């Protein structure tokens, strides 16, 4: 027994959940091949001088799985609720959909709020695209405020593509369970 930790990742379609898991576990961002299946990834992580077995559970974010997806929730040690920093709709869904759904099935499990696609937040074409819809990328203070609102233990931002902040997401996830 390496200590085992079950981590489940949830959030809207296209927020980057699968890329996040693959980039983390393989140290490589998927190119033109992102698994469509909702797999479980097994990673090992050193925490305070001890190896931990992190099982990472990908989920489908579409409405069609609203009855099937929660069957993966039992025995979860920590949830990651993901939204894209460059999709305000995905951010609103953290409060509207994901927080309520997780808490319906798992009242006490820690939640980390994770803002993805960090590399796009200061990307000009992305800012302009959002400005056209009277919108702007989600800022760190906004994400932090959403994290408090949903009782998250931690708010993190990362990019699966550049890997900036990626390892911290899962270190903090583990520490939320273990210390
Ligand atoms: N620029 C950027 N694109 C990303 C990142 N992570 C994922 N993507 C892209 O976002 C899209 C959705 O990613 P995916 O992992 O399939 O999202 P999922 O539906 O939540 O599983 C794909 O086109 C990815 O290439 C990131 O960190 N930066
Ligand atoms: Cl999805
Ligand atoms: Cl917080
Ligand atoms: Mg996926």
From Swiss-Prot:
Organism: Homo sapiens
Glycosylation sites noted in the Swiss-Prot or TrEMBL record: 33
Lineage: Eukaryota, Metazoa, Chordata, Craniata, Vertebrata
Entry comment on modification after translation: (Microbial infection) Glycosylated at Tyr-33 by Photorhabdus asymbiotica toxin PAU_02230. Mono-O-GlcNAcylation by PAU_02230 inhibits downstream signaling by an impaired interaction with diverse regulator and effector proteins of Rac and leads to actin disassembly. Ubiquitinated at Lys-167 in a FBXL19-mediated manner; leading to proteasomal degradation.
Tissue distribution of the protein: Highest levels in brain, also detected in heart, placenta and pancreas.
Positions of short motif Effector region: 33-41
Membership in a protein family: Belongs to the small GTPase superfamily. Rho family.
BP term (GO), one: Wnt signaling pathway
Sample GO molecular function, one term: calcium-dependent protein binding
The protein's role, per its UniProt record: Plasma membrane-associated small GTPase which cycles between an active GTP-bound and inactive GDP-bound state. In active state binds to a variety of effector proteins to regulate cellular responses, such as cell spreading and the formation of actin-based protusions including lamellipodia and membrane ruffles. Promotes cell adhesion and spreading on fibrinogen in a CIB1 and alpha-IIb/beta3 integrin-mediated manner.
Main location: cytoplasm
Pfam families: Ras (PF00071)
Subcellular location: Cytoplasm; Endomembrane system; Cell projection, Lamellipodium; Cytoplasm, Perinuclear region
Binding site for GTP: 11-18, 58-62, 116-119
Illness: Neurodevelopmental disorder with structural brain anomalies and dysmorphic facies: An autosomal dominant neurodevelopmental disorder characterized by global developmental delay, severe intellectual disability, poor language, seizures, dysmorphic features, and thin corpus callosum.
Keyword terms of this UniProt record: Cell membrane, Cell projection, Cytoplasm, Cytoskeleton, Disease variant, Glycoprotein, GTP-binding, Hydrolase, Intellectual disability, Isopeptide bond, Lipoprotein, Membrane, Methylation, Nucleotide-binding, Prenylation, Ubl conjugation
EC id: 3.6.5.2
Subunit structure comment from the entry: Interacts with the GEF protein DOCK7, which promotes the exchange between GDP and GTP, and therefore activates it. Interacts with C1D. Interacts (via C-terminal region) with CIB1; the interaction induces their association with the cytoskeleton upon alpha-IIb/beta3 integrin-mediated adhesion. Interacts with NRBP.
Protein name per its UniProtKB record: Ras-related C3 botulinum toxin substrate 3
Disulphide-bonded residues: none
Placement of covalent cross-link Glycyl lysine isopeptide (Lys-Gly) (interchain with G-Cter in ubiquitin): 167
Catalytic activity annotation: GTP + H2O = GDP + phosphate + H(+)
